[PDB]
């Protein structure tokens, strides 16, 4: 009951959080009887939100609904209550308020960017009462959520999966925005470059095999610390190839142990073969021969030749045999053939489209250092468009459009931020503010030439971090035919590509969507090279692939298509952050530190501000909250 809402908010029921016992140090340093009913009164809080997130839970009515013991503790009541709201677990996304706002505001902050960790920041601090304006470069909120919709079709450029509701905060806003979400068949066929399946024999080997490989380099990396060689850290993709080579190693091995036994019993039967052509021999002669006596005595030795030869000739023909069974029974000649090993590539092009790099990029220590947090439950589809998030957030928020902040200044004093506008360039705004939250992509942020200048420049560690850090490439490819050819059975089938190259160009089709639209991935290294294609070849290659698939006469030409460019796009430059090799989820700690130039004004959230969530719609929100929370502590 109470139990699972703790759970629902990424804690643990029976336990208190650091952040907890920091806030309420006369609690655990008090007797245990009060930590426990603290725990129920937090516990319980979280319940009576997460039953009912559509409309704000006041500290009235968290009285009002506790049970008989606890709603007489009204001081540690409203400790508890304000504690949750503060760090957005209890009022967060959109609900409606019971009271409106006050009309006077205690501070003024500036959010740079309007995706879902702006908007989630901007709509907490605006809760809390002070003065909020979001400046975002685009014509539109949503930033790295994207969603196309033309006529009746609707279909997600940037994020589209919801990656298991238990724990997930998107649950609430789902609830809040009504979201129509849709859980993924895990059914996915490959089909070959020549557009023929992959059997299912094959298909579930190359998947083990794969697996083994993976586990493999993370038994490398964490029981042999195999993690730094020749003074340069080991990429996932050089732990892949060690592993391989390993592999192909011990084929070739047995290759040659299973060659020498042929060989030697080979060599045996030769020198039976000789053996008996000199006993033959023998009998021969022997064959050409008191007299009655000696005669019998010949007859007597010649018996004794030919059973000895009998003797023999089982024996020829029992090895005869085991020579037969080893020719018969060799083992692999190669690890994997050519067709082996482009399946292998596909499921590799898999983790390169989920990280959104290339496998040689990642490090091998730390590229999964955030699968701990990962939420339980089914992973889900956005059929409604995720953009259906941050326009839901948007609404009631001071957000100027079209508005490309260029520098950001800060001081002891107070923050100006200088933006132009992207319409007119001549034309130029001059915000005063009393803090700065920075949510740009850290694409942007990496920008060797800068897009927007810091006033005095970002300190050493903070610039460290920022360009130790990955920040990883993946595209899409928006098919809108005008009937289904394909099976509805399947949300995905992959394409299996030639070449080791290019094996993440056009390897993952997704069927997600009320109206006829396909979804193709560009992965790895594949993702940044083809966005120098024209949308036109690009639809083309899509098109050859869907036709040897289905039938030339089976796919139509497609009425609508959208090609996302986020490399190239000047406000993302990128997909997602990732742990390159050089760098560790600390760096991530660091983009979230704030700066100070005393109290702190340049605050810092996004994607890549948050250990345990990174490269999520989630970890963005999550992270807007936290920044939130922050700025409040501070200037409140
Ligand atoms: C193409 C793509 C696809 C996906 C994902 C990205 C992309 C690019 N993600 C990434 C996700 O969107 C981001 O993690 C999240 O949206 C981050 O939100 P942020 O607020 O931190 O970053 P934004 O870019 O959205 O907002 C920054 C704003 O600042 C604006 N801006 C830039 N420069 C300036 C400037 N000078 N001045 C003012 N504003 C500026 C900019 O226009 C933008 O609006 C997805 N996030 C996700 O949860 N689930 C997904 O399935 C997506 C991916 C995924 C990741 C992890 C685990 C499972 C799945 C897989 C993919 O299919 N979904």
Same mark, same amino acid.
């Given at each position: 009951?109470?139990?699972?809402?703790?759970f629902?908010?990424?804690?643990?029921?029976?336990?208190?959080?650091?952040?907890e016992?920091?806030?309420?140090?006369?609690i655990?340093?008090?007797?245990?009887?009060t930590?426990?009913?603290?725990?129920?009164?937090?516990?319980r809080?979280?319940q009576l939100?997460?039953?009912?997130?559509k409309?704000q839970?006041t500290?009235e009515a968290?009285?009002?609904?506790?049970?008989?013991?606890?709603?007489?503790?009204?001081?540690l009541?409203?400790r508890?209550?304000?504690?949750l709201?503060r760090?957005?677990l209890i009022?967060f996304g959109?609900?409606?308020?019971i009271?409106p706002?006050?009309?006077k505001?205690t501070?003024?902050?500036?959010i740079?960017?309007?995706?879902?960790?702006?908007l989630a920041?901007?709509?907490q601090?605006?809760?809390f009462?002070?003065?909020?304006?979001?400046?975002e470069?685009?014509?539109?909120?949503?930033?790295r959520?994207?969603?196309?919709?033309?006529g009746n079709?609707?279909?997600?450029?940037?994020?589209m999966?919801?990656?298991g509701?238990?724990?997930?905060?998107?649950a609430?806003?789902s609830?809040?925005?009504?979201?129509?979400?849709?859980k993924?068949?895990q059914?996915?066929?490959?089909?070959?470059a020549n557009?023929?399946?992959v059997?299912?024999? !094959?298909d579930?080997?190359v %998947?083990?095999?794969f697996?083994?490989?993976?586990?493999?380099? @993370?038994?490398?990396?964490?029981? &042999? /610390?195999?993690?730094v060689?020749?003074?340069?850290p080991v990429?996932?993709?050089?732990?892949?190839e060690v592993?391989?080579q390993?592999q192909?190693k011990?084929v070739?091995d047995?290759?040659?142990?299973?060659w020498?036994?042929?060989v030697?019993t080979?060599?045996?039967?030769?020198?039976?073969?000789?053996?008996?052509?000199?006993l033959?021999?023998?009998?021969?002669?022997?064959?050409?021969?008191?007299?009655?006596?000696?005669?019998?005595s010949?007859?007597?030795?010649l018996?004794?030749?030919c059973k000895e030869?009998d003797?023999l000739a089982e024996?020829?023909?029992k090895?005869?045999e !085991?020579?037969q069974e080893? %020719?018969?029974?060799?083992?692999?000649?190669?690890?994997?053939? @050519?067709?082996?090993?482009?399946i &292998? /590539?596909?499921?590799f092009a898999?983790?390169?489209?989920?990280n959104?790099?290339?496998?040689?990029?990642?490090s091998l220590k730390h590229?999964?250092?955030?699968?701990?947090?990962?939420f339980?439950?089914?992973?889900?589809?956005?059929?409604?468009?995720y953009?259906?998030?941050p326009?839901a957030?948007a609404?009631?928020?001071?957000?100027k459009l079209?508005?490309?902040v260029?520098?950001?200044?800060?001081?002891?004093?107070?923050?100006?931020?200088?933006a132009?506008?992207?319409?007119?360039?001549?034309?130029t705004?001059?915000?005063?503010?009393?803090?700065?939250?920075?949510?740009?992509?850290?694409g942007?942020?990496?920008?060797?030439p800068?897009?927007v200048?810091?006033?005095?420049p970002?300190?050493?560690?903070?610039?460290?971090?920022?360009?130790?850090?990955?920040?990883?490439?993946?595209?899409?490819?928006?098919?809108?035919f005008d009937?289904?050819?394909?099976?509805?059975?399947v949300?995905?089938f992959?394409?299996?590509?030639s070449?080791?190259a290019?094996?993440?160009?056009?390897?993952l089709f997704?069927?997600?969507?009320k109206?006829?639209?396909?979804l193709?991935?560009?992965?790895?290294?594949?993702?940044?090279?083809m966005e120098?294609?024209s949308?036109?070849?690009?639809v083309g290659?899509?098109?050859a692939?869907?036709?040897?698939?289905?039938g030339s006469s089976?796919?139509?030409?497609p009425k609508?298509?959208?090609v996302?460019?986020?490399?190239?796009?000047?406000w993302a430059?990128?997909?997602y952050?990732?742990?390159a090799?050089?760098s560790?989820?600390?760096?991530?700690?660091?983009?979230?530190?704030?700066?100070?130039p005393?109290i702190?004004?340049?605050?810092?959230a996004?994607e890549?501000?948050?250990?345990n969530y990174?490269?999520?719609?989630?970890?963005?929100?999550?992270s807007?909250?936290?920044?939130a929370?922050?700025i409040?502590?501070?200037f409140?």
């Amino acid at each position: 009951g109470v139990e699972g809402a703790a759970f629902q908010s990424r804690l643990p029921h029976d336990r208190m959080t650091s952040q907890e016992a920091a806030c309420f140090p006369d609690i655990i340093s008090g007797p245990q009887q009060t930590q426990k009913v603290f725990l129920f009164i937090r516990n319980r809080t979280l319940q009576l939100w997460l039953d009912n997130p559509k409309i704000q839970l006041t500290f009235e009515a968290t009285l009002q609904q506790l049970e008989a013991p606890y709603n007489s503790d009204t001081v540690l009541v409203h400790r508890v209550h304000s504690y949750l709201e503060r760090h957005g677990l209890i009022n967060f996304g959109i609900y409606k308020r019971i009271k409106p706002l006050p009309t006077k505001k205690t501070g003024k902050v500036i959010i740079i960017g309007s995706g879902v960790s702006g908007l989630a920041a901007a709509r907490q601090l605006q809760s809390f009462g002070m003065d909020v304006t979001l400046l975002e470069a685009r014509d539109r909120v949503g930033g790295r959520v994207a969603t196309f919709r033309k006529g009746n079709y609707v279909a997600d450029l940037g994020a589209m999966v919801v990656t298991g509701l238990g724990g997930n905060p998107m649950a609430v806003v789902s609830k809040q925005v009504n979201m129509e979400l849709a859980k993924i068949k895990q059914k996915c066929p490959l089909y070959e470059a020549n557009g023929q399946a992959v059997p299912k024999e !094959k298909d579930e080997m190359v %998947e083990q095999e794969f697996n083994r490989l993976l586990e493999a380099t @993370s038994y490398l990396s964490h029981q &042999l /610390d195999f993690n730094v060689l020749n003074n340069k850290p080991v990429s996932l993709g050089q732990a892949l190839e060690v592993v391989i080579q390993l592999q192909e190693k011990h084929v070739k091995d047995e290759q040659i142990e299973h060659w020498k036994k042929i060989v030697k019993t080979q060599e045996e039967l030769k020198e039976l073969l000789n053996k008996m052509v000199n006993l033959k021999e023998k009998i021969k002669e022997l064959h050409q021969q008191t007299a009655e006596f000696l005669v019998k005595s010949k007859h007597r030795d010649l018996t004794a030749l030919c059973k000895e030869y009998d003797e023999l000739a089982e024996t020829q023909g029992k090895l005869e045999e !085991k020579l037969q069974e080893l %020719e018969a029974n060799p083992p692999s000649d190669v690890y994997l053939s @050519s067709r082996d090993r482009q399946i &292998l /590539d596909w499921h590799f092009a898999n983790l390169e489209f989920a990280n959104a790099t290339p496998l040689s990029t990642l490090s091998l220590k730390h590229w999964d250092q955030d699968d701990d947090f990962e939420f339980t439950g089914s992973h889900l589809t956005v059929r409604n468009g995720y953009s259906c998030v941050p326009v839901a957030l948007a609404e009631g928020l001071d957000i100027k459009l079209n508005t490309a902040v260029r520098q950001v200044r800060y001081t002891a004093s107070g923050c100006e931020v200088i933006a132009v506008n992207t319409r007119s360039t001549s034309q130029t705004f001059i915000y005063k503010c009393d803090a700065v939250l920075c949510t740009l992509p850290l694409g942007v942020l990496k920008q060797q030439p800068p897009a927007v200048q810091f006033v005095p420049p970002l300190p050493e560690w903070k610039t460290s971090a920022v360009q130790r850090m990955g920040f990883g490439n993946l595209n899409k490819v928006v098919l809108c035919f005008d009937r289904v050819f394909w099976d509805p059975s399947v949300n995905l089938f992959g394409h299996v590509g030639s070449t080791t190259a290019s094996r993440g160009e056009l390897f993952l089709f997704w069927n997600l969507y009320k109206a006829p639209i396909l979804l193709a991935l560009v992965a790895g290294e594949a993702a940044g090279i083809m966005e120098n294609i024209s949308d036109d070849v690009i639809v083309g290659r899509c098109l050859a692939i869907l036709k040897g698939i289905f039938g030339s006469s089976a796919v139509p030409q497609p009425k609508e298509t959208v090609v996302s460019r986020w490399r190239a796009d000047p406000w993302a430059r990128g997909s997602y952050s990732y742990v390159a090799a050089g760098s560790s989820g600390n760096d991530y700690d660091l983009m979230a530190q704030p700066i100070t130039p005393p109290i702190p004004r340049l605050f810092f959230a996004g994607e890549h501000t948050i250990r345990n969530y990174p490269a999520t719609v989630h970890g963005a929100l999550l992270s807007g909250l936290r920044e939130a929370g922050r700025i409040a502590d501070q200037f409140l």
